[PDB]
């Protein structure tokens, strides 16, 4: 939970160019698709049995929004990620039983969706900075297991 000025920059500068509505669903799907066992948590979402079944699944979008939402949420509150994600934490752990490793996965798929949408713009100096945040959020999220 400490990123330099240099980093603070890139981060907020590329998140401002982010389709807050579609990168979130784009991520949660790339998750259920690259990490297939993450589907077992979205049973009540119906069709997922195929990459596109998932990529087009509507609930898979409505949800990927609130997810890429808390991210942006935390991004404002970089220096107290614990606070920012407290209730969201006890939910996935105390309630849903989502093994915390999966958290560092969704953050890593995420970073991948960025590289996609921003080509050479998403440069290493950029990724590093972001890599640090994704870890933040994720470690943040898992605190009710620590």
């Amino acid at each position: 939970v400490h990123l330099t000025p240099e980093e603070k920059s890139a981060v907020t500068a590329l998140w401002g160019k982010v389709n807050v509505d579609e990168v979130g669903g784009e991520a949660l799907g790339r998750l259920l698709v690259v990490y297939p066992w993450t589907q077992r948590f979205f049973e009540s979402f119906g069709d997922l049995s195929t990459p596109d079944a998932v990529m087009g699944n509507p609930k898979v979008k409505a949800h990927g929004k609130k997810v890429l939402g808390a991210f942006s949420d935390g991004l404002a509150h970089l220096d107290n990620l614990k606070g920012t994600f407290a209730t969201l934490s006890e939910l996935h752990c105390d309630k849903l039983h989502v093994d915390p490793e999966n958290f560092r996965l969704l953050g890593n798929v995420l970073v991948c969706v960025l590289a996609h949408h921003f080509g050479k713009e998403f440069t290493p100096p950029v990724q590093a900075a972001y890599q640090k945040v994704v870890a933040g959020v994720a470690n943040a999220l898992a605190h009710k297991y620590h």
Binding site: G29, R30, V33, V34, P36, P51, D52, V54, M55, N108, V109, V111, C112, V113, A115, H116, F118, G119, K120, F122, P124, P125, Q127, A128, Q131
Partner: protein, 141 residues
Amino acid sequence: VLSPADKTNVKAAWGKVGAHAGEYGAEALERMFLSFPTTKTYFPHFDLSHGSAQVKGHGKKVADALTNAVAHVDDMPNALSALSDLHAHKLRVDPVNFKLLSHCLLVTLAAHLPAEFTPAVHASLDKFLASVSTVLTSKYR
């Protein structure tokens, strides 16, 4: 571990990279010492500074070792055996670091091949890289 379709999307992506491998290697590499710094102890002599002719000729050794694998897909253990003994016996690379590089290596493809990087190719690429990792970190004794 790798199904028919998986192998398909692999070649699918090697191609549209073709001989760009040599760079994407170094690029994926620099992304690593820049994203997770711990990984630097493995390269004590190196100058991990941008452009390094070191990080460039290394990425080739890498990207080519992968091509070798995308080639010998139905049998990587034996075809990658030379490499499995540098990383498992000599180098003693922590399995963790591989997950890191297979990840960087993956963000390079995503940002140099937006048409090929598809949710299912994305996946198949992970299983692939994961499977490469398992082989280079297998032999430990």
